[PDB]
Amino acid sequence: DAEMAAFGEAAPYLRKSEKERIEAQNKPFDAKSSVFVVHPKQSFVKGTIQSKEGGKVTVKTEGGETLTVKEDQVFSMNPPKYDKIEDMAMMTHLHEPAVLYNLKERYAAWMIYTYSGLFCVTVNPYKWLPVYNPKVVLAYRGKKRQEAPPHIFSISDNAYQFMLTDRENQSILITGESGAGKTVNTKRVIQYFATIAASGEKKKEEQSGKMQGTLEDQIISANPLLEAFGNAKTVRNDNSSRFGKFIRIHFGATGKLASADIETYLLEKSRVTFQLPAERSYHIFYQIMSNKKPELIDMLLITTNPYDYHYVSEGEITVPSIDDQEELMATDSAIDILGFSADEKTAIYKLTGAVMHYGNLKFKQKQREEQAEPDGTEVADKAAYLMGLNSAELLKALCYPRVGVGNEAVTKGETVSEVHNSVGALAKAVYEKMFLWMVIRINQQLDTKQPRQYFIGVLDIAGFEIFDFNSFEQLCINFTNEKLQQFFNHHMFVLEQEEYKKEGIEWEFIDFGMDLAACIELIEKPMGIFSILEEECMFPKATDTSFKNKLYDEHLGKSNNFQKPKPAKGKAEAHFSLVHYAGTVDYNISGWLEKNKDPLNETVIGLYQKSSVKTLALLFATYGGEAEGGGGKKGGKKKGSSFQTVSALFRENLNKLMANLRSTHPHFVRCIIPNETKTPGAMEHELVLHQLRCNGVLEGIRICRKGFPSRVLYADFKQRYRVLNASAIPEGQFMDSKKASEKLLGGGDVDHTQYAFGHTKVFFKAGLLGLLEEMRDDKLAEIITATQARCRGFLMRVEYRAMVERRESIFCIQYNVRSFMNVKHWPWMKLFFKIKPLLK
């Protein structure tokens, strides 16, 4: 309360009033009866234990329901002291339910940031909050996470701190499902950096501030370009990230901004050509056809009605929450700031329209032949011109692909179906490349000469998602995540072990990563999936089926993580399941071989390679330089620098990454999505539960509980408990951030067993907190019983003062009555009586 001011307005969403707290922690609780329990419809609901069937349990509900469930379908419930705990990992009850429940409660209260160990859980508000508030930004500035409530800037600042304090590079790993809202965070983190450590001095003035011509802006401006090209309306989000990314913010020596570095991973090439019914393609398209810059429409030779471009109107065209017109400029302007040449800025556009046109390219069967022949030179003409090509040459290459089988170049004829498909392949190919280029070009501007001493990497990618249908793309992502996870499990193992070393506890344990090495080797190692995948790609006459068998003959029965599918449930077909940390994933191998080969009509590429549109020409260069290497039929593309695998890079890139991640001090952020239905203050259970498993959150709790569940960070320990032996615990905490907590525990009639210290934190049992209380319980009997007595004593002590006072007033009353009883019958007195009145 006193503290909170900085936020003030945000406060309510960060922390609760000091009595709201108090009114919550200090309330009646019946441990032995209060519990969490399994539940057929709702995941886990709370209840009170009624009876006990010797190994069955009957419980009441909170809604009113009675169920008799197993002994282990029943889970304890944390004392009220742990209501809306900033760090669930401090709880003395490391369960599945308690975690779900904590998140949930502090959300219904509008607190989106709750920590779960090292993580920084984040829940989609689905509404607006004063959190990103320009006041907060400062507030979180220079504060350990124990000096402030759960928030992302905490993570983000600490990184910075740590950056300069330890002289190590840092990282932030943001991860969640499609609708979790990571971009948003990522972006928000980024602003944070830019703000708190900028100072271009000259660039700071209110004169076209943030326009092209400064980075802090470039840095920023970056996003809105990428977003136009790599973002789209998903059925979950309205601006979903259809690719992954890694930015390196290169801080200087002083500590002020110096450089940036983007890298893109796994772009959703398919959107370019397809789209689900409730979705839509990349924005750009819709941006452009919006008509805010009419020249563009005529320049590209298109219309404003998307239904003229099959490729981009298979799903939806308009989204209410998006103003395509505004963005177009945003985009536009960003390009400029980004330093692109008008020409390039022209290529981009012109090139983005060609692609639309391609999808309009039509063909027909030559008569009496099964060959494809152009169905007109209306569109080709446009595509051709827009790309700096020749209509004819183009349609030929497309129709009569001139190949090179043997030591020559053999002209091959294609079918209608073959063309339509090849076209689509280029459309996608071109878009991609371009996108890649843009990134590079961005990076290029984001390159300064100033020295760099450290960087802070911000990684944004998807998390392990399980679908009834898992294809190639899923493997690639899952694999990424299963790696990332191990990356953590280790950091934690390293980390943990420091405490027990700092404190002096005697705990031995094996790396937690190790548990996952099994799965990883199976994928990335030599006779593993990828290899078998990338070898077969060399066999001119291999089949998905072929590949499949090779997969089995070699891994089946011999490998544990390897399994043959469970074809039924919500799944669509059979091929192979894997046993990832998050669970079993059923993978379908169909298209892999192809997808992995990235087959492109080289004749056409030829044309690109010699376009009048330099940029287009450029994008293709690297294909043109490896052809030397795969001159004759069969063989190896790599000889000339051409990719041999769809997967060959992914790995290379994923390695270059995980390596960059190592020379880093990992900082974790887990983004969460409350309800599919888009409702603030709500949460489907099992939906959040899922995420938690695949997040790493539930695995961090596990590793924590091995053991000594709740683990308190030292400052977080000082503040909250100094008050217990106030003098001696405060001194300890202040005198040595760690040594303090040590010193503190000096007092209390508590089990000096139940805990254990170490380099970054204390370890504590539960049934520990349970132990604590008990001691406490006895200590009040003392306190009370004694306080009762005095009272009791004192109580009667006042009775004597009254008894005594009364002493005479009674007598007076006593005797006085007696008189009368005697008198009232006496003549003389009756006389006086009748007579007493006549007097005066």
Swiss-Prot record:
Hinge, as annotated region: 835-837
Complexes and interactors: Muscle myosin is a hexameric protein that consists of 2 heavy chain subunits (MHC), 2 alkali light chain subunits (MLC) and 2 regulatory light chain subunits (MLC-2).
Domain IQ, first and last residues per copy: 780-809
N6-methyllysine: residues bearing it: K32
Protein name: Myosin heavy chain, skeletal muscle, adult
N6,N6,N6-trimethyllysine: residues bearing it: K127, K548
Myosin motor domain segment(s): 83-777
Similarity annotation: Belongs to the TRAFAC class myosin-kinesin ATPase superfamily. Myosin family.
Sequence ranges assigned to domain Myosin N-terminal SH3-like in this UniProt record: 30-79
UniProt modified residues of type Pros-methylhistidine: H752
Location(s) in or outside the cell: Cytoplasm, Myofibril
Residue ranges of the region described as Actin-binding: 654-676, 756-770
Residues that hold ATP according to the record: G176, E177, S178, G179, A180, G181, K182, T183
Free-text note regarding domains: The rodlike tail sequence is highly repetitive, showing cycles of a 28-residue repeat pattern composed of 4 heptapeptides, characteristic for alpha-helical coiled coils.
Parent sequence residues shown: 5 to 844 of 1939
Described function: Muscle contraction. Myosin is a protein that binds to F-actin and has ATPase activity that is activated by F-actin.
Lineage, highest ranks first: Eukaryota, Metazoa, Chordata, Craniata, Vertebrata
